[PDB]
Scaffold this active site. Structure first.
Site, PDB file in Angstrom:
ATOM      1  N   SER A   1       0.959  -1.164  -0.076  1.00  0.00           N
ATOM      2  CA  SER A   1       0.363  -0.373   0.040  1.00  0.00           C
ATOM      3  C   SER A   1       1.107   1.601  -0.141  1.00  0.00           C
ATOM      4  CB  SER A   1      -0.405   0.389   0.908  1.00  0.00           C
ATOM      5  OG  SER A   1      -1.845  -1.026   1.117  1.00  0.00           O
TER       6      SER A   1
ATOM      7  N   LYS B   1      -0.142   3.576  -2.916  1.00  0.00           N
ATOM      8  CA  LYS B   1      -0.505   5.003  -2.428  1.00  0.00           C
ATOM      9  C   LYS B   1      -0.278   6.271  -2.678  1.00  0.00           C
ATOM     10  CE  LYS B   1      -3.843   0.679  -1.908  1.00  0.00           C
ATOM     11  NZ  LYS B   1      -4.251   0.055   0.404  1.00  0.00           N
TER      12      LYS B   1
ATOM     13  N   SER C   1      -5.885   3.229   4.520  1.00  0.00           N
ATOM     14  CA  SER C   1      -5.141   2.455   3.404  1.00  0.00           C
ATOM     15  C   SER C   1      -6.242   1.520   2.738  1.00  0.00           C
ATOM     16  CB  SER C   1      -4.357   1.266   3.941  1.00  0.00           C
ATOM     17  OG  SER C   1      -3.526   0.831   3.434  1.00  0.00           O
TER      18      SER C   1
ATOM     19  N   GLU D   1      -4.609  -4.185  -6.994  1.00  0.00           N
ATOM     20  CA  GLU D   1      -5.408  -4.320  -5.417  1.00  0.00           C
ATOM     21  C   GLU D   1      -6.075  -5.761  -5.425  1.00  0.00           C
ATOM     22  OE1 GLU D   1      -4.764  -3.964  -2.941  1.00  0.00           O
ATOM     23  OE2 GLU D   1      -3.404  -1.574  -2.828  1.00  0.00           O
TER      24      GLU D   1
ATOM     25  N   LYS E   1       2.222   6.227   5.415  1.00  0.00           N
ATOM     26  CA  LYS E   1       2.065   5.782   4.606  1.00  0.00           C
ATOM     27  C   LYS E   1       2.335   4.557   4.900  1.00  0.00           C
ATOM     28  CE  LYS E   1      -1.784   3.671   2.218  1.00  0.00           C
ATOM     29  NZ  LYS E   1      -1.376   2.457   3.237  1.00  0.00           N
TER      30      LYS E   1
ATOM     31  N   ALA F   1       1.532  -3.995   3.651  1.00  0.00           N
ATOM     32  CA  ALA F   1       1.549  -5.214   4.352  1.00  0.00           C
ATOM     33  C   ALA F   1       1.576  -6.421   3.302  1.00  0.00           C
ATOM     34  CB  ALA F   1       0.942  -5.431   5.744  1.00  0.00           C
TER      35      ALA F   1
END
Length: 267
Positions: A47, A50, A107, A143, A211, A214
């Site tokens: 993430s 992002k 997230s 994602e 930010k 995982a």
């Protein structure tokens, strides 16, 4: 007693994790490398991508091609795992700005996919990275497949050095407007899912904007801007991969690397 220097601690932590650690500490103003360990090795972004995604969206806002107020509606079937904000807004939809806020601060995974649709998908975001002179970072999947972290797989990876350079470009160069840089940084200040990492060791009065990410096979990471006296001074990027350690241990090892940098801040 004074703790060991960060590099001594980092080498010890990597041994304890039975994986790879990659990190850089970069001066925000000059881009100088202050600390580095495996800073040219690839790690899954997870993430942390992002921040780059929301930078690309804000560049389209700057160009007049996107509006943060633009409303997007979506389907139950569009929801991927870990969508704590977007799963609550099937009926009313979300604005582009609300999607960016959800993607950074919570997230939210589906929010990131809805935004990827606007910047040419993973290949488009990679092309935007090449345009700003990042020749290393690559997004390949959406994602949640981008978190797969197969050992050695270069897809959906960055290096600590490339990610730090790219964050510096997005937040302090002319590539984003002053207003867009303030907004991107504010979303990172307002990160809600990073408490157990650098924030857990951050002294009172310090600036933090971060930010997390995982992924599979132990992958975990953070990108951060921090400094004393409520001013951003350095970029810290820490990634872990290929470790069997628990989430609690991975969080505390990243926090510990952060603590070492904070305790040895002054050169």
């Amino acid at each position: 007693n004074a703790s060991p220097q960060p590099l001594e601690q980092i080498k010890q932590r990597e041994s304890q994790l039975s994986g790879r650690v990659g990190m850089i500490e970069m001066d925000l103003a000059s881009g100088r490398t202050l600390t580095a360990w495996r800073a040219d090795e690839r790690f899954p972004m997870m993430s942390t991508f992002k921040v780059v995604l929301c930078g690309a969206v804000l560049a389209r806002v700057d160009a007049g091609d996107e509006q943060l107020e633009r409303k997007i509606h979506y389907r139950q079937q569009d929801l991927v795992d870990y969508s704590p904000v977007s799963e609550k807004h099937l009926a009313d939809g979300m604005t582009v700005g609300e999607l960016c806020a959800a993607a950074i601060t919570m997230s939210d995974n589906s929010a990131a996919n809805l935004l990827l649709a606007t910047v040419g998908g993973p290949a488009g975001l990679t092309a935007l990275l090449r345009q700003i002179g990042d020749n290393v970072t690559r997004l390949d999947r959406w994602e949640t497949e981008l978190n797969e972290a197969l050992p050695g797989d270069a897809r959906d990876t960055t290096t600590p050095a490339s990610m730090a350079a790219t964050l510096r470009k997005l937040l302090t160069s002319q590539r984003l407007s002053a207003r867009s840089q303030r907004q991107l940084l504010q979303w990172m200040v307002d990160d809600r899912v990073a408490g157990p990492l650098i924030r857990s060791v951050l002294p009172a009065g310090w600036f933090i904007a971060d930010k997390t990410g995982a992924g599979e096979r132990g992958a975990r990471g953070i990108v951060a801007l921090l400094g004393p006296n409520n001013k951003a001074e350095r970029i810290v990027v820490i990634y872990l991969r290929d470790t069997p350690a628990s989430m609690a241990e991975r969080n505390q090892q990243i926090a510990g690397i952060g603590a070492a940098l904070i305790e040895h801040w002054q050169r």
